Structures are given as C-alpha cells and as structure tokens.
Amino acid sequence: LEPLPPLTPKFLNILDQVCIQCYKDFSPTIIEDQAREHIRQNLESFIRQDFPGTKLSLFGSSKNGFGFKQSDLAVCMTINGLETAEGLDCVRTIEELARVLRKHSGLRNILPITTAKVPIVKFFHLRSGLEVDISLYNTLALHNTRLLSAYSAIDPRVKYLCYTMKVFTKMCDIGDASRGSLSSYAYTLMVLYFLQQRNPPVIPVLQEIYPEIFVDGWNIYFFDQIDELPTYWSECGKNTESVGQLWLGLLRFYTEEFDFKEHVISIRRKSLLTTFKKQWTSKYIVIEDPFDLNHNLGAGLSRKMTNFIMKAFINGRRVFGIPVKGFPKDYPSKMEYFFDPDVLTEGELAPNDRCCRICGKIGHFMKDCPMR
C-alpha cells in the first residue's frame, strides 16, 4: 500500500471534526426518536384488535445507540404468556400478520418475506416515510441491541466511530445484505472489534467481565453495569486517542494489519479467534455474532463483493490519510470531499450479480419478484 505522510494538528483536528459531524448530522432528533416509539405503540394497538396479547418491541439501530435518520424500524413481535416460538408456527404467523396489516389505512406495500433466515413482514408507513420490518420472537436480536447499546454508552468515541463507519459504508453502497453486501450491524461489530483490540483498548469485552443465561441455546450474558465499569475494567480510560486518530487507525487496521484469512472478527472474546478452529475458512471477511456463534455475518459475500469492499477501504485509507493540495480552503464541504463515492469506489457500482434483475434484491426467482 501507498505509504502515508506525517500529519499535522490542523489536519488531525479536521479528521476529528468530520467524525463528530457524521454523528451530529445523521443521528435522529429526540423528536424523531419519539415518533418511532409512537409508531410502535400504534401498530401494537392495531394488531391487538385481531391478536390480543401482541407485544411489539423496537430493536436494532432504533435502540442500540447508532440509528440514522430514515433508518428502517426494526420491530420484534411476541405474544404475552408464550415464552418462545417453540410452539408458534412462524411462517404461517407471518402470513396471518401480513393480512391483518393490509387493513391499516396508514400503511402501504405490505410484503411478507417468509424464505429469509429471519422471516419478516415489511411495509411502508405513510406519515413518517419510514419502512418497517416485523420479525417474530427475534429474541437474540433484542439482546445484541442491548449489548451494542451498552458499548455506545462507555465512551462518546464509540458513537462517533460507528456513525463514521456507517456513513462510509452507506456512501460506498456496501451496507445492505439484502443486496449481497454486509449489514450495518456487521460493520458496527468491526468497529467494536477494532476498539477492543486497540493498544490500549478503547472498550472492554463486556461478555468477559463479571454467569450462564441461555436464550435459544446461547449464553447471552454480558456486563451491563457501565457506571461501575471503572471497578471491573482495569484499563479504563487508558486510551486517549482522538476520534480522528481512531478512524484512520481503523482504516489502516483493516487494510494493513488484520489478517482476514487467519482470524475471525469476534467481539465476545479478547483472545484472537482463528478461522481454522472455527472451520470458517471458505470466506475472506469472517465475522462472528456475539451470541449466535454459528452465525458468520460474512457468509453471503461473493468474491467480487469482497474485492469491492476491500477496494473501498483502501481508497478510504488514502482519502483520510493523505492530505491534498488546496484542502480545506478550496472545498466548501469537508463531508463531500472525504466521502466522495467517485473516489472511494472509483465511479463503479457495487456488484449485483446475485441480485434479482428486476428489484435488485437477493433471495428470490423472478416469478416471485414483487416489482414485476
């Protein structure tokens, strides 16, 4: 890789400011968050007309501390008194739920997706302009939402970096697993793993600070008493790198240092995890879910998509690491300079060979495409 020049405090200050602006510009207002809670309440009352005892819980980026304006609304549906879906017919329930939702005058384009690993019914909410996705007894997602939320509360730099990673991957168009790339959840795990492995670490491994609490066959314990963390985490407050330093460090870490072919991105343990012991040697980008240890978040990546993703990060390393003549005085927007897709992806679009030629999503043949 191209060697990076030495930097100056003024350029470092610019990097710090850009990362913090990613958070300030794209995090929802408190009013926008309250509206998501109101939608949850409305949907729950409506569904209760046909299915009394229905409970809707928000999860994902709406609740884990890293949500964007206009992010989809991730909803987990359960039934009061029924502990698990062990006795619930999930696919038939998704279809029954879809029919009920077609009677809601404020929703459009109900679409049940019953063939996905996690079946969902998704739809468009007219008044908010938001897409909604309802899943059934998605219990582990509730817990990794709580896990990510706790990490976001340890240090403001966690939020700043996760928002910067989110902007970067969305601008490169590599943050949608329904199109064959990686989920934003997966990229957030990459940020947390980088921060855990930093010397000194910015965050601890909460699942290794303390018990066995099992859900769907997996231990979901983690240390969530963040206000008491200085007592149980010896290295607390040791890392004093600025956000901009950490962002460039992340780009260099995953282009220069991290051995994708040898190691797994795993935030459940501080000790390095090898693909060999995991038997996950078929893929290049290997990311382990913190709870569902059989889930490799990179299992869907093709070779072309992997090359595209790595090329994006290599170009980001260059743009954020090599100052340019005329910057910042000839550029009225630092955001447009650093996150220019024509530079980061060199004008190319993300590969879509696995995607339906009609709608651009994976997972279905053309006769079952909604946009036909």
Place this chain on the structure above:
RNA sequence: UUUU
C-alpha cells in the same frame, strides 16, 4: 445467505 433479504432482520439484528
């Protein structure tokens, strides 16, 4: 391999 369409939620997280």
